[PDB]
Design goal:
This is part of a larger assembly, with chains A and B.
Chain A: E1 4-17, E2 21-33, E3 38-46, H1 49-60, E4 64-66, E5 79-83, E6 86-92, E7 99-100, H2 103-112, E8 117-123, H3 127-140, H4 144-151, E9 154-158, E10 167-170, H5 193-199
Parallel strand pairs in A: 7-8
Antiparallel strand pairs in A: 1-2, 2-3, 3-4, 5-6, 6-8, 9-10
Chain B: H1 10-20, H2 24-27, E1 39-43, H3 45-62, E2 78-81, E3 93-96, E4 109-112, E5 117-120, H4 123-133, H5 149-157, H6 161-171, H7 177-193, H8 205-214, H9 219-227, H10 231-244, H11 249-257, H12 262-271, H13 276-294
Helix pairs in contact in B: 1-10, 6-7, 9-10, 9-13, 10-12, 11-12, 12-13
Classes of the chains: A alpha+beta, B alpha+beta.
PDB class: ribosome
Keywords: ribosome, mitochondrial translation, tRNA, mRNA, 2Fe-2S clusters, polyamines, rRNA modifications, post-translation modifications, cryo EM
Entry title: Human mitochondrial ribosome in complex with mRNA, A/A-, P/P- and E/E-tRNAs at 2.63 A resolution
C-alpha cells in the first residue's frame, strides 16, 4: 500500500503468425516507488492492456533499487552517463529548485522522492533506455560518507547562504589521514562544452528557462 | 583632567565585544535568499580548524559595532536673501552638487525658497537628495511605514528586534533623530520583556549595553547574564558601570571594599541597583549551584 505505480509507455508491438498474420501485443513500461528511495521498473507484455498493466506492476516490485538521496530531496553529486545511445546529465540542485527534467524523469523522481534536480536527455530519447539509464546512474551515486571513508578525510560543505561557515557533512569512520590531498594546479578533467558555453553566456536558447507549472 | 570613556575607546570596545559573544551558528544563519548548489572540499582536521578560524575572523568583521553618535544639530544657515526674487516663483528649487568624489557630508545642497532666500538644505532634505542621486541599496526616499509605532509593535511581538534594527540602519543615518529614536524604543522593549539574547552575537548588542549603562538601568541585563551563567560578562558590566559613573555609590562602595569578581555585583546590587532584592536572590541561586558542581 505504500508503493505507487505510474505508467511510462504503452506500445502496440506486432509479430507475424502463419495462421493469423499480424498478432497485436501490448508492451507496457511502469515504475513503482514508495517515495522514500525504493523504486523499480518493469516491462509487462500481454494481448490485453489490463493484463499487461498487472504483469508489469506486480513484477516491478520484485526489482526495486534503493536510491541514496542527499538530505532526502536531491542527488549527492552531478551524474553524467550514457546508456546505449541515450545521454543523461543530471545536476544537483538546492531546495526549492523543482524537477526541471524530462517528463518521464519527473515521474520517476516523484516515485523515488527526489524533489530538486535538473536533467538534460540527449541522443536517442528511447523511453526504455532513459528509464534503464536513470536507474543505473542514481544507483551508482557515491554518498558523502562513502567518499569520506574512501578518502579518509572530512567532507566540508561550503554554502554561499551561510558565508564561510565550514559544515562537515561526513567524517571518516576509521582513522583520519594527516596528509592533505595533493592539489593539482590544473585539473585534467573532461569538461562538457555545453556547460562551459552556458557559463560564458554564449548559449542563447528561446526554449531554456521558460516559465512552467510547478512540478 | 579625567575624561569619561567614549563608546569607541579600546577598553570599552573589548568589554562590549566580549559581552556580545560569538555564536558562529547565529552569525552565519542560513539566509532565505536565491540559492546555488553548495560546493564541497576534502579537508583534514588541521585544514578544518583553519577554515573555522577564518570563519571566526570573518564573523568578527560582521559584528563590528556601529559607532554611537549624538543627535545632529538642525542646519539653519542662510547663504543669501535676494528679496528681488520674492513672488516670482511659486515653488522652491533644491540644488544638489553631484560631484562624484565628494564625501556626502561635505556636499553643498542649497534651497532657493519662493521668498528669494538661498539657504542650506536641512538634514532631512540633505538625506533625501543623496538618495535621489546616489541611491543606496536598502534605503528609500520616502520613509517606510514600518517605522510607525503600530507597525514597530507588531515586529516586536514577533521577536523581530534585530530585523527592526537592520531596517533602521539602512534607512536612517546614525546621528539622525529617527535613527536614535527607533534604537532607543527597540532597546526599551528588549528591557521590558527581557529579550537580551535576541541581540547577542550581533553588532547591535554593544549599543544596547551602552544605552542601558548611560541611563542607569543595567538591572535587567545583569539578572539575565547571571541566570545564564555569564558571570564574567555580568562582572564586566558592573565594572563598566563604575567607569562611566565613577562618582557613584556603587563605585565608591567597590573602592571602599576593594570588591572584585562576584563582590562587585553584591556591592552594586545593594547601593544603586533598583532591583537589589531580586539580584541578590538570582545571584544567590547561581552561587549555590556552582558550589555543587565543584564537589
Amino acid at each position: 500500500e505504500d508503493f505507487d505505480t505510474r505508467i511510462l509507455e504503452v506500445r502496440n508491438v506486432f509479430t507475424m503468425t502463419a495462421k493469423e498474420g499480424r498478432k497485436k501485443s501490448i508492451r507496457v513500461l511502469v515504475a513503482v516507488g514508495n517515495g522514500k528511495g525504493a523504486a523499480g521498473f518493469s516491462i509487462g507484455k500481454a494481448t490485453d492492456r489490463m493484463d499487461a498493466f498487472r504483469k508489469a506492476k506486480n513484477r516491478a516490485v520484485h526489482h526495486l533499487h534503493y536510491i541514496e538521496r542527499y538530505e532526502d530531496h536531491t542527488i549527492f553529486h552531478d551524474i553524467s552517463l550514457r546508456f546505449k545511445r541515450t545521454h543523461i546529465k543530471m545536476k544537483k540542485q538546492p531546495k526549492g529548485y523543482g524537477l526541471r527534467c524530462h517528463r518521464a524523469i519527473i515521474t520517476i523522481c516523484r516515485l523515488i522522492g527526489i524533489k530538486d534536480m535538473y536533467a538534460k536527455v540527449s541522443g536517442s530519447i528511447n523511453m526504455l533506455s532513459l528509464t534503464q539509464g536513470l536507474f543505473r546512474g542514481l544507483s551508482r551515486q557515491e554518498t558523502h560518507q562513502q567518499l569520506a571513508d574512501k578518502k579518509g578525510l572530512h567532507v566540508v560543505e561550503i554554502r554561499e547562504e551561510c558565508g564561510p561557515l565550514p559544515i562537515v557533512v561526513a567524517s571518516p569512520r576509521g582513522p583520519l589521514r594527516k596528509d592533505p590531498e595533493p592539489e593539482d594546479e590544473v585539473p585534467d578533467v573532461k569538461l562538457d562544452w555545453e556547460d562551459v558555453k552556458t557559463a560564458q553566456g554564449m548559449k542563447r536558447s528561446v526554449w531554456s528557462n521558460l516559465k512552467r507549472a510547478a512540478t | 583632567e579625567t575624561k569619561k570613556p567614549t563608546f569607541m575607546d579600546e577598553e570599552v570596545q573589548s568589554i562590549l565585544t566580549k559581552m556580545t559573544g560569538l555564536n558562529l551558528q547565529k552569525t552565519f544563519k542560513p539566509a532565505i535568499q536565491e540559492l546555488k548548489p553548495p560546493t564541497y572540499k576534502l579537508m583534514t582536521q588541521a585544514q578544518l580548524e583553519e577554515a573555522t578560524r577564518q570563519a571566526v575572523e570573518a564573523a568578527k568583521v560582521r559584528l563590528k559595532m556601529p559607532p554611537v553618535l549624538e543627535e545632529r544639530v538642525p542646519i539653519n544657515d542662510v547663504l543669501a536673501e535676494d528679496k528681488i526674487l520674492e513672488g516670482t516663483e511659486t515653488t522652491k528649487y533644491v540644488f544638489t552638487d553631484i560631484s562624484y568624489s565628494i564625501p556626502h557630508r561635505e556636499r553643498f545642497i542649497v534651497v532657493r525658497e519662493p521668498s528669494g532666500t538661498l539657504r542650506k538644505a536641512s538634514w532631512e532634505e540633505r538625506d533625501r537628495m543623496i538618495q535621489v542621486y546616489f541611491p543606496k541599496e536598502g534605503r528609500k526616499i520616502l520613509t517606510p511605514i514600518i517605522f510607525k509605532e503600530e507597525n514597530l509593535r507588531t515586529m516586536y511581538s514577533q521577536d523581530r528586534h534585530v530585523d527592526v534594527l537592520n531596517l533602521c540602519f539602512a534607512q536612517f543615518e546614525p546621528d539622525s533623530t529617527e535613527y536614535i529614536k527607533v534604537h532607543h524604543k527597540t532597546y526599551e522593549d528588549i528591557d521590558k520583556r527581557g529579550k537580551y539574547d535576541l541581540l547577542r552575537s550581533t553588532r547591535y548588542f554593544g549599543g544596547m549595553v551602552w544605552y542601558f549603562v548611560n541611563n542607569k538601568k543595567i538591572d535587567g541585563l545583569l539578572i539575565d547574564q547571571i541566570q545564564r551563567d555569564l558571570i564574567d560578562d555580568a562582572t564586566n558590566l558592573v565594572q563598566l558601570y563604575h567607569v562611566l559613573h565613577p562618582d557613584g555609590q556603587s563605585a565608591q562602595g567597590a573602592k571602599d571594599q576593594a570588591a572584585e569578581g562576584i563582590n562587585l555585583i553584591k556591592v552594586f546590587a545593594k547601593t544603586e541597583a533598583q532591583k537589589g532584592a531580586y539580584i541578590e536572590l538570582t545571584l544567590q541561586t547561581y552561587q549555590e549551584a556552582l558550589s555543587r558542581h565543584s564537589a
